[PDB]
Amino acid sequence: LAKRIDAALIMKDGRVVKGSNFENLRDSGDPVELGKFYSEIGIDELSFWDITASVEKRKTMLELVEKVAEQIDIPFTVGGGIHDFETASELILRGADKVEINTAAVENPSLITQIAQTFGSQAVVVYIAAKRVDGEFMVFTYSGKKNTGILLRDWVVEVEKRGAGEIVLGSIDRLGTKSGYDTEMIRFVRPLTTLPIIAHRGAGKMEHFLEAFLAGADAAKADSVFHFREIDVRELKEYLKKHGVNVRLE
């Protein structure tokens, strides 16, 4: 299948954290209008990540999903502290196509299966944050704060076994960098799973997307490179097509 380009939007109290540089937008920090604009210029799927610190979070995420579903016609994922089946269920029913889970899945891997039982494997995305520690790829939880001691190799196999649809592979070793995706990490994971692998962290220029796809990624996700317009989405897709990558053009 076609390689996929995803945009992730980090949100807090209903706003896109640090906004965007699209002057054409009425409100460049509105996640709905920004998401809609991305869907029009060639983003394939959207990810909405909420960090509303406690209290209003549940209602905020549900209202976000409802507003997004009304306006956009490409698939989207919602994530950020989804801890149980009922939370995931209400977000999917309100409009999300998929839910994206990390810490709660590591702590209770049956959560993957429970969501998939009702909504299908295709509705369950597991985000795996990994980092090199003493020469092994280790799985990290709590926004990179906790080394679980679980090997990346073991967790990838378990995630597929439990019934996840896709894996987002986030390299903590590339957080905040613009040097490229962690292609070594992608190549390490590729033979271990039949699931779609979505690369995250490290993108800085168009050539990094090509590199990630050569490494075996099925999709590439980014955020600030798009929001601050370091990479244009249409230019990226034209570049990838030029060099033989199967991507969807309009």
Ligand X SMILES: *C1=NO[C@@]2(*)=C1(*)(*)C(*)(*)(*)=[C@](*)(N(=O)=O)[C]=[C]2
Q: For residue 58, what is the enclosing H or E element? A: helix 57-71
The nearer residue to ligand X, 49 or 137, going by C-beta atoms, is 49
Q: In the window 10-29, what residues touch ligand X (CB under 6 A)?
A: 10
Site for ligand X in 133-152 (CB under 6 A): 143
> Per CB under 6 A, does 127 bind ligand X?
yes
Size of the site for ligand X (CB under 6 A): 9
Nearer to ligand X, 78 or 240 (CB): 78
C-alpha distances out from residue 2 to 44, 109, 153, 205, 210, Å: 10, 29, 26, 20, 13
Smaller CB separation from ligand X, 85 or 127: 127
Q: Which of 129, 185, 212, 215 binds ligand X (CB under 6 A)?
A: 129
User: Phi and psi of 107, rounded to 5°?
Assistant: -75, -30
Best CA proximity match to 49, nearest among 122, 111, 119, 102:
102
* Dist. CA 136–CA 215, nearest whole Å: 19
Query: Which candidate, 171, 226, 166, 212, places its Cα nearest to that of 38?
Result: 226
Residue of 42, 80, 109, 165 that binds ligand X (CB under 6 A): 80
Pair of tokens at residue 116: 């998939």
Q: 42 or 80, CB closer to ligand X?
A: 80
Nearer to ligand X, 130 or 240 (CB): 130
Site for ligand X in 85-114 (CB under 6 A): 102
Instruction: Return residues touching ligand X (CB under 6 A).
Output: 10, 49, 51, 79-80, 102, 127, 129, 143
